[PDB]
């Protein structure tokens, strides 16, 4: 009933539902370093977030999500393995139950505590919707999270936490600038993907920086205090919220450094 990360409908279910589970082309993949081909045609990212608008933070009963403003091109992404201009329409993370586990991606077969995806979408398709329809409809920057040194540009995220507990719940969300989670290079590997929760569509570029960033113990603590369920249901904390790596198939991971 509904699709999930427990043990009746997490993962390994998805396929009953959502035939593209089994695709050719579906995400998130191990990244094999000494296998991914430098690609000296790649141009370097340009992202230019300098006007973006967020508008709301919401428990969607999966994830958190913060939503930007994407009527305008007023964050966007550009350059790198794309064509064309896509814009930010929000960001969420994946996370574990321990520190030694959360993200989707892997580097030689290493997980890290979490998983930042910065969600974009190619402006050529006029809306979200149809960009789904299209192979390169969407661009997701992908950001590792290691436990460090706390991170101050995600304390804001951190403290409204609290508001939005329970599936369902969202809080107004304005003036938060996503130039504070990223790491210092902008180094990446790419390869063409899907979208890592149902409905699965291939529809990915991913784009998985290289550096990742460091969080706290205590920052990511937070996140692992939010629930699946809705208010007046019984807790399951919002753990594990990961599905595991894929096969690669036929497809080539290039990196943008040697
Ligand atoms: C998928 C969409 C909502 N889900 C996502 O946007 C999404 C984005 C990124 C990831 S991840 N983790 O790979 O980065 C996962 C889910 C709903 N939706 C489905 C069809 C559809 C059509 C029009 C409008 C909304 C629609
Ligand atoms: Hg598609
Ligand atoms: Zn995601």
């Known amino acids: 009933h509904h699709w999930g990360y427990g043990k009746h409908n997490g993962p390994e279910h998805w396929h009953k539902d959502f035939p593209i589970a089994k695709g050719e082309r579906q995400s998130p993949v191990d990244i094999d370093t000494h296998t991914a081909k430098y690609d000296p045609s790649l141009k370097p990212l340009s992202v230019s977030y300098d006007q973006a608008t967020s508008l709301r933070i919401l428990n969607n009963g999966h994830a958190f999500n913060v939503e930007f403003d994407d009527s305008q091109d007023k964050a966007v992404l550009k350059g790198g393995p794309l064509d064309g201009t896509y814009r930010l329409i929000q960001f969420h993370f994946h996370w574990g139950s321990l520190d030694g586990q959360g993200s989707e991606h892997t580097v030689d077969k290493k997980k890290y505590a979490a998983e930042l995806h910065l969600v974009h979408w190619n402006t050529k398709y006029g809306d979200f919707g149809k960009a789904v329809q299209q192979p390169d409809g969407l661009a997701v920057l992908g950001i590792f999270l290691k436990v460090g040194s706390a991170k101050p540009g995600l304390q804001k995220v951190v403290d409204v936490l609290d508001s939005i507990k329970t599936k369902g719940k969202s809080a107004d969300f304005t003036n938060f600038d996503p130039r504070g989670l990223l790491p210092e290079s902008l180094d990446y590997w790419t390869y063409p993907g899907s979208l890592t929760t149902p409905p699965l569509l291939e529809c990915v570029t991913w784009i998985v920086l290289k550096e990742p960033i460091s969080v706290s113990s205590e920052q990511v603590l937070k996140f692992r205090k939010?629930?699946?369920?809705?208010?007046?249901?019984?807790?399951?904390?919002?753990?594990?919220?990961?599905?595991?790596?894929?096969?690669?198939?036929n497809r080539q991971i290039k990196a943008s450094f040697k």
């Open 226 to 249: 939010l629930n699946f369920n809705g208010e007046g249901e019984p807790e399951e904390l919002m753990v594990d919220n990961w599905r595991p790596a894929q096969p690669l198939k």
